[PDB]
Amino acid sequence: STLRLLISDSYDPWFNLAVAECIFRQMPATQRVLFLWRNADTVVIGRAQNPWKECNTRRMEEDNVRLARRSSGGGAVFHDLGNTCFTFMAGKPEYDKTISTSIVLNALNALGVSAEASGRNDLVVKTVEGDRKVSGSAYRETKDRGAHGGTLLLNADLSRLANYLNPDKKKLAARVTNLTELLPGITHEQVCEAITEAFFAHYGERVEAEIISPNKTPDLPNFAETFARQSSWEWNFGQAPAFSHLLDERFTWGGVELHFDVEKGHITRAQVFTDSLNPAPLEALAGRLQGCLYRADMLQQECEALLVDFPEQEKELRELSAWMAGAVR
């Protein structure tokens, strides 16, 4: 058919995320996919974040919370079973982010809630007490496809993210509602059905649900390998950075932490972390700092030898250099 419907029966965040990843990069862009899942207690971090800084790893071990690193940039989110997650994927040029949005909107209204889009990534429900945000989401796009992933708040414990994150000095000095409040009784199963029907209605087509779990791996290419990597401690946590120097700042487009050693006046190793949505140029910068003379003018030279390779991140990259120029010497 033209449709693939995947329902996870597993609360394993590394399995669920593994599926979202295969859908986006492993699957062919021939079909249209809806994946619905939920996670047990998990902190999800952007791919370039330092969880040893971002997260209270000790409290996470105690209270039994998993850490998962996603392949996209950005900052950290907390998930419990009170979150219902979705991902839509469709090949281009026929796909756009309005389609998935309209489907979730459809399901929410069908469920009994007066919902509409607020800006790009948010869905809000209209209330006499005002707009309530019930859903966050993110969009990822390719030459051949677009993907829309997000979470709905059914009965999430909203006081939990604080327990599992460390205070970020420079970030601080730089509404949200559960559906069970509006629909007492709402459940994961009901939301999944409603989104599924709205999915089928829009496309004018019906497929059977492919129920998937680790006990029973899904019909996806290179999944075994993707799952093995996603659930690996080396990927999610990785070794903590142990460097002598640290340059850090909080910009409007993300925090940056530049760790490095200096020996004989030159950088002998470096590592960058960020919650930026586009870490790639920061990664490239770290690569170019290897062996660099530890001097302001020099840090700029390497940081502007990339501007040509990262046109879309021009502004940022120069908030960067102008920062290294005043932060070093």
Ligand X SMILES: NC(=O)CCCCc1cc2c(cc1O)Oc1cc(O)ccc1N2
Q: Residue 130 — left, alpha, or beta (φ > 0 → left; ψ -120 to 50 → alpha)?
A: left
Nearest CB to ligand X, comparing residues 24 and 260:
24
Q: Own/partner pairs for 277-281, CB < 8 Å, 24+ apart? A: 277/46, 277/72, 277/73, 277/74, 277/253, 278/73, 278/312, 278/313, 278/316, 279/46, 279/47, 279/48, 279/73, 280/310, 281/306, 281/309, 281/310, 281/313, 281/316, 281/317
Please indicate if the annotation marks 75 as binding a ligand.
yes
The two three-digit tokens of residue 197, written as one number? 């029907």
Nearest CB to ligand X, comparing residues 100 and 106:
100
Least spacing, CB of residue 126 vs ligand X, in Å: 19
Write out the binding residues for ligand X, residues 28-67 only, by CB under 6 A. 44, 46
Site string for ligand X, 263-302 (x = CB under 6 A): --------------x-------------------------
Site string for ligand X, 140-179 (x = CB under 6 A): ---------xxx----------------------------
Query: Is residue 74 part of the contact set for ligand X (CB under 6 A)?
Result: yes
Q: In the bound complex, which residue of the shown chain has the CB atom lying closest to ligand X? A: 149
Nearest CB to ligand X, comparing residues 136 and 238:
136
- Quote helix, strand, coil % in the chain, to nearest 5: 35, 30, 35
In the chain, the amino acid numbered 184 is P
Query: Is residue 75 part of the contact set for ligand X (CB under 6 A)?
Result: yes
Residues found near ligand X in the complex (CB under 6 A): 17, 44, 46, 70, 72, 74-75, 77, 85, 87, 136-138, 149-151, 277
Residue ranges of the annotated binding site are 70, 75-78, 133
